[PDB]
Amino acid sequence: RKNISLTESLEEYIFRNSVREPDSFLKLRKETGTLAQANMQISPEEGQFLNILTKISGAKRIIEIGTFTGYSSLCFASALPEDGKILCCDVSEEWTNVARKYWKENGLENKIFLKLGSALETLQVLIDSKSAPSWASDFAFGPSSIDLFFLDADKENYPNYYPLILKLLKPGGLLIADNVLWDGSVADLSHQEPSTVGIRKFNELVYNDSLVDVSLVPIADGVSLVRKRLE
Amino acid sequence: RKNISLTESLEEYIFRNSVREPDSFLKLRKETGTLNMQISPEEGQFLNILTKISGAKRIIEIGTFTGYSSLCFASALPEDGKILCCDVSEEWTNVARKYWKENGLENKIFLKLGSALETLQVLIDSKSAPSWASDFAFGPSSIDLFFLDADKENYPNYYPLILKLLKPGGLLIADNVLWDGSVADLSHQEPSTVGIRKFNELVYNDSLVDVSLVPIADGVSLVRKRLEH
Numbered sequence: 001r002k003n004i005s006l007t008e009s010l011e012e013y014i015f016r017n018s019v020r021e022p023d024s025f026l027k028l029r030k031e032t033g034t035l036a037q038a039n040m041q042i043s044p045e046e047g048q049f050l051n052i053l054t055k056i057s058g059a060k061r062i063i064e065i066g067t068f069t070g071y072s073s074l075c076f077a078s079a080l081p082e083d084g085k086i087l088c089c090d091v092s093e094e095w096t097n098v099a100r101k102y103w104k105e106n107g108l109e110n111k112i113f114l115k116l117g118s119a120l121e122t123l124q125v126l127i128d129s130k131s132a133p134s135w136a137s138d139f140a141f142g143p144s145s146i147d148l149f150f151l152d153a154d155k156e157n158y159p160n161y162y163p164l165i166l167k168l169l170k171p172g173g174l175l176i177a178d179n180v181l182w183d184g185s186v187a188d189l190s191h192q193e194p195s196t197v198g199i200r201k202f203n204e205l206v207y208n209d210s211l212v213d214v215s216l217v218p219i220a221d222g223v224s225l226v227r228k229r230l231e
Numbered sequence: 232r233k234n235i236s237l238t239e240s241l242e243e244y245i246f247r248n249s250v251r252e253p254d255s256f257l258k259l260r261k262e263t264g265t266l267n268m269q270i271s272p273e274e275g276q277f278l279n280i281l282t283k284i285s286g287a288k289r290i291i292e293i294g295t296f297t298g299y300s301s302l303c304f305a306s307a308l309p310e311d312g313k314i315l316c317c318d319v320s321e322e323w324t325n326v327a328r329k330y331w332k333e334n335g336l337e338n339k340i341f342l343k344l345g346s347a348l349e350t351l352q353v354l355i356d357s358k359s360a361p362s363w364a365s366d367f368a369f370g371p372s373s374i375d376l377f378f379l380d381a382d383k384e385n386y387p388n389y390y391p392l393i394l395k396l397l398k399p400g401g402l403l404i405a406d407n408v409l410w411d412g413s414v415a416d417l418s419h420q421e422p423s424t425v426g427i428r429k430f431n432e433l434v435y436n437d438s439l440v441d442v443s444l445v446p447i448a449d450g451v452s453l454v455r456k457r458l459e460h
């Protein structure tokens with residue numbers, strides 16, 4: 001094995017030695033745990049990973065595709081510099097109502113932009129925009145305008161988000177892709193669900209794309225670091 | 232429960248879907264194999280991508296061995312980027328240079344043999360650049376990125392030196408922070424284990440940094456020196 005075998009005990013050690021979690025963030029995880037799609041949200045470890053990556057990258061304009069109850073957006077929003085901003089794309093009013101509850105609790109709303117609706121559409125309108133739509137005014141628009149992407153939406157559509165992400169990203173920009181291992185089902189060809197297929201196709205596109213570099217990190221359910229190359 | 236359980240076939244899948252390894256790098260791994268102390272190609276590419284993302288131009292590597300990570304750093308670096316390697320062994324760094332030279336990377340690479348504790352302190356205290364760091368960097372707050380992969384028992388001692396040498400916003404990448412899981416088991420009180428444990432505690436309690444402890448390889452900590460406001 002290339003990677004350490006994790007145990008419960010070792011995961012608790014990791015938590016106790018890396019995770020410094022605000023009570024409001026913990027509050028959100030507990031609230032989300034009540035919901036059926038509770039496991040749809042990231043670990044606080046993954047949160048911290050996104051946090052450090054945002055800082056390391058120097059990102060000032062982020063787009064999150066798939067927001068849910070808002071944990072990751074909370075991590076991005078607090079990691080951004082005071083002049084840094086994030087656009088969140090989600091189909092759900094209900095869940096992003098929970099997200100905003102926590103954005104407000106943490107005083108981060110000023111940094112955060114929300115566009116409800118289909119993300120394929122939200123991204124295309126942003127690409128084609130000549131001036132900024134009201135919801136992206138003072139954020140960004142047009143191709144090569146984004147520093148960092150977080151992809152965590154509907155999995156079957158991952159290969160369709162990819163070209164749009166790549167067009168919106170500045171050269172040197174970063175795509176962070178969630179769920180790239182899909183509980184290990186990606187490696188098992190008996191699994192042919194639309195979500196599993198989308199993720200496999202996405203991983204394949206990224207791997208064979210000479211315009212990017214990839215690091216597939218076995219954190220959480222797999223996290224791909226996909227950097228758009230210069231020129 | 233927090234992270235996916237990896238299998239060897241899932242690791243094979245990860246390899247096939249991320250690793251694009253130059254023949255030279257593969258050859259070095261095979262060679263090193265004849266003599267475990269070195270990284271996977273997966274960790275190499277992780278270090279590669281972090282180098283580009285961070286925009287680092289001055290890297291110090293503490294612990295070089297046969298040189299696989301240094302090769303990843305040196306090729307990831309821009310044309311004007313540079314790496315200083317610190318190692319105790321002429322013998323292993325001789326293998327490192329063989330591969331530096333094969334890849335035409337020597338111009339970007341600096342080397343100081345000896346106790347890295349002494350190398351780092353000398354670099355901090357230098358009024359002008361020492362011969363081995365001329366046209367690299369010297370003094371406090373002069374370094375963008377560190378890879379820490381040397382003698383584990385001295386991890387707590389490297390830490391304050393790294394922090395002094397790092398620019399604000401600079402990155403420390405620390406290898407072996409999980410140490411085969413031993414860090415979580417208090418029956419294990421080996422000097423190496425004690426050093427890594429203490430290092431982890433120091434990092435976690437230090438408000439001058441942020442940390443992400445990534446369960447790749449034998450544990451990799453990303454430790455970023457915070458900006459000074």
Ligand SMILES: Nc1ncnc2c1ncn2[C@@H]1O[C@H](CSCC[C@H](N)C(=O)O)[C@@H](O)[C@H]1O
Nearest residue numbers: 041066067068071072090091092119153154
């Ligand atoms: N086509 C689509 N466009 C935009 N959002 C979508 C979408 N399909 C599903 N989603 C949303 O994407 C979310 C995926 S779960 C995202 C997890 C979240 N980033 C967290 O940290 O908790 C769900 O809330 C779902 O409503």
Ligand SMILES: Nc1ncnc2c1ncn2[C@@H]1O[C@H](CSCC[C@H](N)C(=O)O)[C@@H](O)[C@H]1O
Nearest residue numbers: 269294295296299300318319347380381382
């Ligand atoms: N006190 C010390 N100062 C600097 N290097 C040391 C040291 N003690 C041991 N080392 C060296 O640290 C090296 C790195 S261990 C090998 C890992 C290497 N970075 C790689 O990618 O392959 C070994 O060669 C060992 O000789």
